[PDB]
């Protein structure tokens, strides 16, 4: 097994971490554990402080953050790390309460160049004679980690919805029934929207517009609920009055045609890298919406247009499978 | 001074 490690520019510090992807189970979140290796020369003055901070960044510092502070229960990883290192490997461990949000970064606009806009998790370690003598950044270490979730193993029932509406003057309502083939769709897997329609109204569908709409909200910001189209598909299939239609469209959300969008949430980036579309957010309690974080949800919208307009919306789960 | 690059290290399997 391998353990992560970062060094300090001064050469007097080193931070170890078992992983930078802490799986978030429904009831308990994995603990952040490691040991700081420090030089006894500056240790003679004062011991080491270790900081775990969680920060959310928006705008263009404009940041709201929670700073858990520890100044230097031993898990197996801690015991192994101390056994390998030795005397000065003073251990540390944070416990992440489940209500804290996961790592999600927004799509950067081409007009701006920032590191990220979203939640990040950080682990820090420095030496200082006093808590306010933060003069030299050269004596610190800054390592970034993430908290992630995976899809549940128990899918729900077949997502299905329908709407019977008489279009203006009409005799009996048009019946549109759309049924996805499951609720838990993995990232990029086709969404086979089974579409059945029958009609007696004089109206007829001229175009059928099928799209995947990503829904995301910023709980910190008031009235912040953003939805942008993804993988919009416009077929020209028609169903004249008194007919019956059935088709299996294979839609697929993707990033290529939506890279120019603003605010498209993606999975948390460590470096200035590129990641897939954001996964959905899980929670098992009736949790009050935590101040920090971005909640991401996906819905498929199927629309019909006539010479008026009707449409129904179907929610589904979009997450990576549990490894 | 600029920051260092996150690396990795080896611990025993047991």
């Amino acid at each position: 097994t391998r353990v992560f490690k970062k060094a300090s520019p001064n050469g007097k510090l080193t931070v170890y971490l078992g992983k930078r992807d802490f799986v978030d189970h429904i009831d308990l979140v994995d603990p952040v554990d490691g040991v700081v290796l420090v030089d006894p020369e500056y240790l003679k003055e004062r011991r080491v402080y270790v900081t775990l901070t969680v920060a959310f960044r928006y705008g263009r510092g404009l940041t709201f953050r929670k700073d858990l502070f520890v100044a230097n229960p031993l898990t197996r990883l801690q015991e192994r790390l101390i056994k390998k290192l030795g005397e000065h490997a003073y251990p540390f461990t944070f416990e992440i309460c489940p209500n804290l949000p996961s790592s999600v970064t927004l799509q950067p606009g081409p007009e701006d160049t920032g590191k990220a806009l979203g939640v990040d998790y950080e682990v820090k370690a420095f030496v200082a004679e006093n808590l306010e003598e933060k003069i030299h950044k050269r004596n610190s270490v800054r390592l970034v980690i993430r908290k992630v979730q995976y899809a549940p193993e128990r899918p729900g029932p077949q997502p299905t919805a329908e709407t019977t509406r008489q279009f203006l003057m009409s005799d009996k309502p048009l019946h549109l029934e759309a049924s996805l083939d499951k609720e838990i769709y993995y990232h990029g897997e086709p969404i086979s929207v089974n579409v059945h329609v029958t009609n007696n109204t004089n109206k007829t569908v001229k175009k059928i517009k099928i799209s995947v709409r990503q829904y995301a909200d910023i709980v910190l910001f008031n009235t912040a609920q953003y939805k942008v189209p993804v993988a919009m598909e416009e077929a020209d299939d028609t169903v004249a009055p008194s007919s019956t239609f059935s088709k299996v469209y294979t839609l697929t959300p993707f990033l290529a045609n939506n890279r120019e969008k603003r605010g498209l949430a993606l999975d948390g980036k460590l470096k200035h890298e590129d990641t897939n579309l954001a996964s959905s957010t899980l929670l098992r309690e009736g949790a009050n919406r935590e101040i920090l974080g971005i909640i991401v949800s996906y819905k498929v919208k199927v629309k019909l247009v006539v010479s008026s307009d009707v449409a129904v919306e179907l929610p589904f789960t979009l997450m990576h499978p549990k490894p | 001074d600029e920051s260092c690059t996150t690396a990795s290290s080896s611990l025993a399997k047991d």
Partner: nanobody, 111 residues
Framework: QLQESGGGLVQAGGSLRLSCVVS????????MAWYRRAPGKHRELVAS???????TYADSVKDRFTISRDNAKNTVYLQMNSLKPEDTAVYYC????????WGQGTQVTVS
């Protein structure tokens, strides 16, 4: 980046002298350590040399080892005199905090 010297076959009853060269700014006011790796196992920590020149040992043996630290030439010296078969390993050098890029080491073999 760092480079090391010394290393080679030795026989019990003698002595071997080892040294390293460190680039960058990781030497002047920073204690310099040395390490040894058993075949197939993780590295063991050997000795030290602090900024002031005095020594502190994390070794479980702490016998017949001399550490010389040079604040001018950019080098650190470690000395072996009490050769035992357990010394048969690959020896490396780095900071106590192992900050520098952990590069190639040197090999010592006895008996």
């Amino acid at each position: 980046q760092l480079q090391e010297s010394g290393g080679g076959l030795v026989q019990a009853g003698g002595s071997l002298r080892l040294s390293c060269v460190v680039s960058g700014f990781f030497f002047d006011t920073v204690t310099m350590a040395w390490y040894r790796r058993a075949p197939g196992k993780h590295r063991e920590l050997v000795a030290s040399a602090t900024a002031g020149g005095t020594t502190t040992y994390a070794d479980s043996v702490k016998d017949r080892f001399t550490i010389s630290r040079d604040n001018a030439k950019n080098t650190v010296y470690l000395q072996m005199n009490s050769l035992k078969p357990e010394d048969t390993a690959v020896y490396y050098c780095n900071t106590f905090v192992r900050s520098l890029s952990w590069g190639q080491g040197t090999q010592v073999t006895v008996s």
